[PDB]
Amino acid sequence: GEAPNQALLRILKETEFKKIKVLGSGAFGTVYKGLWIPEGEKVKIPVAIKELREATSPKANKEILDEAYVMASVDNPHVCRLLGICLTSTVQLITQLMPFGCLLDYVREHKDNIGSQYLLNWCVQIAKGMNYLEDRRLVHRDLAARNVLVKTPQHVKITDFGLAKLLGAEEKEYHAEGGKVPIKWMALESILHRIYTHQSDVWSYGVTVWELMTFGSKPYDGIPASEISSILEKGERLPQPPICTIDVYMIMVKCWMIDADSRPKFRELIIEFSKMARDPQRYLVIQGDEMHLPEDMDDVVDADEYLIPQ
Ligand SMILES: [Cl-]
């Protein structure tokens, strides 16, 4: 680590957010939905506001500000940008709204309508997204279908930097605290040595692709977490999904290889899936493919078009 992080954290007035309406509740916290209307600008930006439960127990305010710190330090089409924070009672994360939600829910709730062109394209976009984070020396640690949001069915972005970690020109690993990370998405060296690395994200990427190819299945739906370690140890891996050619499945397996360095690089995955996406019917055999996917507001601009220096 060495280059200075000259990102801008923007504090936003609680009086700039109209039309609030709870999106997802949940144990962890609460995501809202609203309209951010910059102070003296004829623009209304559709936003999600995240206020994670734990009342004010400063323990929270940490996680939420680390989230913010990272989310504010990323500029990529395939990664969610932090719009700003709000210093109300508790802190709030304000970010571009992703109208179609989680990619996980999105595939779950659209199976009989998702073409191969999309699935392969998303894998491209998530690989692009990750490669970016690789460049910004940044280990996501929690890549899952549930952390990819959908802007439009042809444009996804990665999110949830709750466990993300910056590295160093020195550093190559991240020796975690007391683990609180999903087992079914984490590399084998993550589950035994609490080691995290870019190549560990690769594994999670593999599992993510596995989720999409299976339209939302739960990795190891049977097996309980206290057992995951043992299974992978013996050699077992996720099955090959129905719609999946060997070409595509073998990419998934390559991500789950015991020697981390033998795993593909995200820049290879971009290339590989990118090739594949030029002829999607040849790598994915989806029954029915060849599929279509879908007060006043003059002043609405997507965040993606709301810029300002930097
Ligand atoms: Cl679930």
26 marked as part of a ligand binding site: yes
Radius of gyration of the chain from Cα atoms? 20
299 marked as part of a ligand binding site: no
Q: Look at residue 138 and tell me if it is in a domain.
A: yes
Give the structural domain span for 68.
Answer: 1-97
Same domain membership, residue 109 and residue 69 = no
50 marked as part of a ligand binding site: yes
Same domain membership, residue 152 and residue 74 = no
Contacts of 148 (CB under 8 A, 6+ apart): 102, 103, 104, 122, 126, 156, 157, 158, 159, 208
Q: Decide if 27 contacts 3 (C-beta within 8 A).
A: no
Same domain membership, residue 152 and residue 88 = no
**What is the structure's resolution, reported in angstroms to one decimal?**
3.1
Q: What is the DSSP string of the chain?
A: --S-------B--GGGEES-------TT--EEEEEE--TT-S-BEEEEEE--SSTT-THHHHHHHHHHHHHTS--BTTBPPEEEEEESSSEEEEEE--TT-BHHHHHHTTGGG--HHHHHHHHHHHHHHHHHHHHTTEE-S---GGGEEEEETTEEEE---SS-EE--SS---EE-SS--S-GGGS-HHHHHS-EE-HHHHHHHHHHHHHHHHTTSPPTTSSS-HHHHHHHHHHT--PPPPTTB-HHHHHHHHHTT-SSGGGSPPHHHHHHHHHHHHTSGGGTB--TT---------SSB--GGG-----
The token pair that represents 69 in the structure block: 């710190």
Spatial distance between the Cα atoms of 140 and 127, rounded to a whole number of angstroms: 13
Same domain membership, residue 72 and residue 179 = no
Location of structure tokens 């802007």:
151
Same domain membership, residue 284 and residue 163 = yes
The token pair that represents 93 in the structure block: 């994360």
This structure was determined by: X-ray
Spatial distance between the Cα atoms of 101 and 151, rounded to a whole number of angstroms: 8
Same domain membership, residue 39 and residue 115 = no
Distance 7 CA to ligand 1 centre (A): 35
- From 66, 75, 135, 142, active-site residue: 142
The token pair that represents 175 in the structure block: 């020796």
Q: How far is CA 69 from CA 36, 93, 141, in A?
A: 20, 10, 16
Neighbours of 223 (CB within 10 A): 14
Burial of 145 (0-12, 13-18, 19+ CB in 10 A): buried
Location of structure tokens 């040849």:
282
Same domain membership, residue 122 and residue 10 = no
Buried b (16+ CB within 10 A) or exposed e, 231-255: ebeeeebbebbebbeeebbebbebb
Respond yes or no: is residue 142 known to be catalytic.
Answer: yes
Spatial distance between the Cα atoms of 206 and 213, rounded to a whole number of angstroms: 10
Same domain membership, residue 182 and residue 166 = yes
Spatial distance between the Cα atoms of 265 and 273, rounded to a whole number of angstroms: 12
Q: How far is CA 299 from CA 21, 38, 108, in A?
A: 19, 11, 33
Spatial distance between the Cα atoms of 96 and 307, rounded to a whole number of angstroms: 12
What's the distance, CA 111 to chain centroid? Answer: 20
Spatial distance between the Cα atoms of 104 and 56, rounded to a whole number of angstroms: 30
Contacts of 250 (CB under 8 A, 6+ apart): none
Q: Look at residue 310 and tell me if it is in a domain.
A: no
Sheet with 45-50: strands ordered across = 17-18, 31-36, 45-50, 91-96, 82-87
What is the residue type of 122?
A: W
Distance 30 CA to ligand 1 centre (A): 17
Same domain membership, residue 49 and residue 191 = no
Q: How many domains does the chain have?
A: 2
Q: Look at residue 305 and tell me if it is in a domain.
A: no
φ, ψ dihedrals at 123, nearest 5°: -60, -30
Same domain membership, residue 110 and residue 173 = yes
What CATH number is given to the structural domain containing 70?
3.30.200.20
Among the candidates 80, 97, 114, a domain finishes at 97
Q: Look at residue 309 and tell me if it is in a domain.
A: no
Q: Look at residue 306 and tell me if it is in a domain.
A: no
The token pair that represents 63 in the structure block: 């996680």
Same domain membership, residue 125 and residue 265 = yes
What CATH number is given to the structural domain containing 180?
1.10.510.10
15 marked as part of a ligand binding site: no
Distance 146 CA to ligand 1 centre (A): 8
Distance 218 CA to ligand 1 centre (A): 7
Same domain membership, residue 218 and residue 104 = yes
Q: Look at residue 129 and tell me if it is in a domain.
A: yes
Q: Look at residue 303 and tell me if it is in a domain.
A: no
